[PDB]
């Protein structure tokens, strides 16, 4: 009870110490959202500006704006990611 | 309370919770009443001793436990039992406190002068 274990439910209602400790807990989540938005947005911007001109060319290679080869095939298999599915290899796991 | 208590201990723990209930002890010797009076505070001892006067000459050593707790810098002089010393110093300290209150209220409010803003009612044309 002293160190923040709330033994009540939301139906039962919190004791005043439990109410204050629960407010201390929820303020952490509010702070985490508010201070994570800016760093996440900066990460997204830096990720975009590092790769924005990287693209699949007509010889099926992946090149940047300098026409340097990044990947010889996209994803090393040359396939778009919106049509591949989770499948199982039948011969990998079973014994001889 | 996972404790066993005999009749002495039962009576003195109940009475050690409600010292305030004692008006008149009847005829109990102090040697029996020794525990409940040691866990006590001097105003209650004054109440007990002024309802149960026959205990007075027995309880004086008890007052020492109070004196070295409230007047730890002091010692009795000769012809001074601890009860009368505790009452004399207690009333002397209360009188010193009352004199100090009547000084630092009179000599701080009435005697000296403090400066603050006064209302004007001028309506001056200095701002026209």
């Amino acid at each position: 009870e002293s160190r923040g274990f709330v033994e009540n439910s939301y139906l039962a209602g919190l004791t005043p110490t439990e109410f204050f400790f629960h407010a201390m807990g929820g303020r952490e989540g509010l702070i985490d959202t508010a201070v994570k938005t800016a760093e996440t947005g900066y990460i997204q911007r830096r990720l975009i500006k590092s790769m924005e001109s990287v693209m699949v060319k007509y010889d099926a290679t992946v090149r940047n704006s300098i026409n340097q080869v990044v990947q010889l095939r996209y994803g090393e298999d040359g396939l778009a990611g919106e049509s591949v599915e989770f499948q199982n290899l039948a011969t990998l796991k079973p014994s001889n | 309370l996972p404790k066993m208590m005999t009749l002495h201990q039962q009576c003195i723990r109940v009475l050690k919770n409600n010292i305030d209930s004692i008006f008149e002890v009847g005829g109990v010797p102090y040697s029996v009443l020794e525990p409940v009076l040691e866990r006590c505070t001097p105003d209650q001892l004054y109440r007990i001793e002024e309802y149960n006067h026959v205990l007075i000459e027995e309880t004086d050593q008890l007052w020492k436990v109070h004196c070295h707790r409230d007047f730890k810098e002091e010692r009795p002089e000769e012809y001074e039992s601890w009860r009368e010393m505790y009452l004399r110093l207690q009333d002397a300290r209360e009188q010193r406190l009352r004199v100090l209150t009547k000084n630092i209220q009179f000599a701080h409010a009435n005697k000296p002068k403090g400066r603050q803003a006064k209302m004007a009612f001028v309506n001056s044309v200095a701002k026209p």
Partner: protein, 209 residues
């Protein structure tokens, strides 16, 4: 201690000769898998006493296609390396008309000595290796995929197939640990074979810059 230093010398020799076999030099299968006991028998047990002496540990190998193309592996006794030891080694190389050598140093080389190496690099190719770096084979690590040094005809066929210039390939530094392992100079291309989560196998090509 003599035992731990003998273990160090055996590990250095094993990694050196794995490197020489990976570089295409003729190193027989008997001396790839040389055990610690066989190294103790052939060389010695107490390097501080001097039964395995580092000067006696010098390895001379010849390349598979060209038997006259030989390379040395030198083991200086002193922890650092100065200009004097470099001059002695290149004099030995000149009197044995050999243009390639590896120098397995203990602590390092002086900056003047590295300057001498890069100055004499047009004539004699001398590679700096720390003993700490050579205590394991980094190409046997699970993070390191397979590197194959490409011949010039393979490079021209690669650039003709993908219609590329050399600067359009991915790059690898000449100071890269695998690049230093394979002893590749600027302008060469390394074919990297690695497993793929999506395709199974993927081949990358990296120009040395």
């Amino acid at each position: 201690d003599d035992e731990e230093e003998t273990y160090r010398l055996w590990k250095i020799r094993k990694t050196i000769m794995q490197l020489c076999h990976d570089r295409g030099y003729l190193v027989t299968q008997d001396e790839l898998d040389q055990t610690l006991e066989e190294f103790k028998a052939q060389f010695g047990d107490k390097p501080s006493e001097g039964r395995p002496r580092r000067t006696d540990l010098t390895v001379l190998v010849a390349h598979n296609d060209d038997p006259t193309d030989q390379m040395f592996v030198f083991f200086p006794e002193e922890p650092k390396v100065g200009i004097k030891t470099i001059k002695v080694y290149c004099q030995r190389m000149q009197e044995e008309n050999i243009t390639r050598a590896l120098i397995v140093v203990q602590q390092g080389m002086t900056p003047s000595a590295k300057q001498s190496l890069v100055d004499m690099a047009p004539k004699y190719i001398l590679e700096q290796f720390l003993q700490q770096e050579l205590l394991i084979n980094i190409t046997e690590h699970e993070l390191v995929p397979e590197h194959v040094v490409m011949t010039k005809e393979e490079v021209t066929e690669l650039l003709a197939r993908y219609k590329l210039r050399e600067n359009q390939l991915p790059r690898i530094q000449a100071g890269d640990p695998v690049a230093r392992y394979f002893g590749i100079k600027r302008g060469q291309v390394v074919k990297i074979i690695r497993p793929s989560e999506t395709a199974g196998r993927y081949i990358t090509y990296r120009l040395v810059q």
